[PDB]
Design a protein around this nucleic acid. Sequence first.
RNA 1: AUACGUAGGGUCCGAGCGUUGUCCGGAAUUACUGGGCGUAAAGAGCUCGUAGGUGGUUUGUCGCGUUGUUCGUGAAAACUCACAGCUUAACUGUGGGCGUGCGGGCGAUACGGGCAGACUAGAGUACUGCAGGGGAGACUGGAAUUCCUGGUGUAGCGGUGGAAUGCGCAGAUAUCAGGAGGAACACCGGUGGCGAAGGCGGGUCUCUGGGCAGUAACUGACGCUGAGGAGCGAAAGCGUGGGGAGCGAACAGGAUUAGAUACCCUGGUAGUCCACGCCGUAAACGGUGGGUACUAGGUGUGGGUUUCCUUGGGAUCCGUGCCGUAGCUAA
Lengths: 122, 198, 130, 87
Amino acid sequence: PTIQQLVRKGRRDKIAKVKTAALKGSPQRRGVCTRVYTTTPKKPNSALRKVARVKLTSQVEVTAYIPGEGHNLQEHSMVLVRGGRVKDLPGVRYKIIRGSLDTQGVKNRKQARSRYGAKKEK
Amino acid sequence: RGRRDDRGGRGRDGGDKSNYIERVVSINRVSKVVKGGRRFSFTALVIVGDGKGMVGVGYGKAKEVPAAIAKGVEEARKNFFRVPLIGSTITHPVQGEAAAGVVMLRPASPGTGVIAGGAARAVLECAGVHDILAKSLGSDNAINVVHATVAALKLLQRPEEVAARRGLPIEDVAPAGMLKARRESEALAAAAAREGSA
Amino acid sequence: MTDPIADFLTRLRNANSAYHDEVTLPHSKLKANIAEILKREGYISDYRTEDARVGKSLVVQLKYGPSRERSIAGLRRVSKPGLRVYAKSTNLPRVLGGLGVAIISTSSGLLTDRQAARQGVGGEVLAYVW
Amino acid sequence: ALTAEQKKEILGQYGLHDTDTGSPEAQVALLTKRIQDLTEHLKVHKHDHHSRRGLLLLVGRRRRLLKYVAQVDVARYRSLIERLGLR
RNA sequence: AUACGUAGGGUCCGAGCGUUGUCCGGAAUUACUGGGCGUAAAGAGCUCGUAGGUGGUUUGUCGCGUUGUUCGUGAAAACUCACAGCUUAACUGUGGGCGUGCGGGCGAUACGGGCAGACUAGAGUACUGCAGGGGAGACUGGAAUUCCUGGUGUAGCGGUGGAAUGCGCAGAUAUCAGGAGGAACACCGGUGGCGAAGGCGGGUCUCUGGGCAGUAACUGACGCUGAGGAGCGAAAGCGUGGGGAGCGAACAGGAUUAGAUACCCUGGUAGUCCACGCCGUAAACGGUGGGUACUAGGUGUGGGUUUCCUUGGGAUCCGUGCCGUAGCUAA
């Protein structure tokens, strides 16, 4: 298409379409959680999912999910937030690792046994 | 395509000659809106072929999956198609189209293998291909992709065609490159014929 | 008006495709030699140049065999204005994987892929027909 | 417009020779005088807004021929330039 | 619930095994390779043209571009080929290819390009006519409306699905005649023309716009595109002074209606018109940029000229429709 016009200008890609925004593309950050109130998922997936809002060390205030059944984190907790993708919830794209800095692993998790911070059964 | 492995006391199972490899790519449920209701039928695309290479394409629009398969098989028997190649290669790189679907084909080193997409893999391996390179683009579909496969295959011919068109023989038409490839192909064929003679 | 040789090839394509058995053309030496080599390798029947509007004119007969089928498979100028194309002795492209023939305007004149490969000079390729 | 007699006498005057209508100087003179004619037709038809396009087209053709005059021989170019008093 | 959770039971991997973070490809998802812009994303409202790109036919030169060649050249490791060893492997050593290049000398003259040119098909100029709502400017017309003037002459008129707003009865409606006003030109008025596009139509006059046609008369490639930039450019709206007959936003009463502010009626202000200006947006669309060479037809249809019957018919070139070949489109 007007090779000379290409020489004039052109050929740039469209848009980055960024995903992670905690900072530094961090494999994980840590911070203080608050506002751990449970909200509603989508109507077809009628349930209630436990989440929280964490101010990470990255100086950004993001929304993290609390995977599993039981939780250990409360207010003023050193929660380690990792990236996630929860299409079941609006604007929720983070999780908190169990069996880690603050949140104890999910009690008696056995199907996963690596996720949900469930250590080896003795 | 359910409960096809049956061993009964009936007569036969309709076996014949033409030990042809069959394949089916996909069937989409087809909805006719009658007044206040939906009738559901099936659409099968059947590709039959031979290890020698000759191919057939059929299209069964039947409200039953086995009827659709049979209709596609018999249309492929009606709608056959022949392909020239070089041993296990293609005689020359080609491009084919079905209205949005584009397919590129290319000869490869002997033994490279049929590197092709899911639909293309079937449409090719039903023929005598063992080692060519190919890919496809566009149409975001499969029916048009399968249709364009045969479109590309149609552009295939022996060097004899261009030799007669030019009046001049091979050489410029078929240079050593293909010359030696077709020599290997025909020599392997002749050796196989000699072995099968005894 | 910018490109005469592209119009040459376009007229060949249309005239052969539209089943005409002949085509008429102004005779600039470029297209003259293009059709000359074309009949040399036999994708057309025969070319003859006579007198016309102030220049001359070349008339080309397309080779059709037992039926209305053209020895020409297609035509496409490659080294077009704005995208003029140069090639060397080693990477001399093989037309239709080598099946077809090309035009390469060598420093030594005009040659195809095989001829230049046998010799070994390059610099300017042109359309190819197969 | 360029009346059939005034254009002929202009061709005789500034043209390279007789019958050489269309020579660059000849066309320059013809279009120049046509432009001078339209100069006042526009000044009385202040809202003509329709002959000005032809004005500009003829001006552009005059310049497009002036460049050819200059490239072939700057001498004739200067000759006509100070003959007609342009710029 | 084989999707959850739990058990077996199976898949696979193993001192690993999964999760998060990031990059490449898959993506043709920037389409040089390797995309499109009628209806899906995409032709500015339209002109010219600077920069730029970009090129007709032909003679000789140059060999810059371009290619051919010799050499310097591109550290080692790189990475690979080949060899050897590290218990094997990892790993290391050895030598190759490789280091795709640049630079220097030498060559080619097909092509681009440069130089000298030359030619007329391109382009541009003339001759002679063809279509005219192309524009502008100045002059004029009366229809007709309303108002005003003199009558005759009535209690009704107009209003709407009906009403009631409005008025008459003073003479309203009406009829005739007259005057005033302001605006526009029905019929012709349509694939028919003109115009770059917005646009063009009562008549006269003046200036002017461009196109088409037959003679090469001539110039002798003066071609095209065109970013920036340039003006023009529907209506509205505002600046400035007029107009206003009518319409008429806004704003007024009455009417359906729960609500009218709305449809309906009863009026009318800016505007609508003119003069000089502003702005620049419209669905300013063949939704199809400008230009150029080829690809069955058929049929309406404007301008021209020629050629063939005795106006009749043909050809040709330009405008303008529809259908239909090839071929193209997702259709």
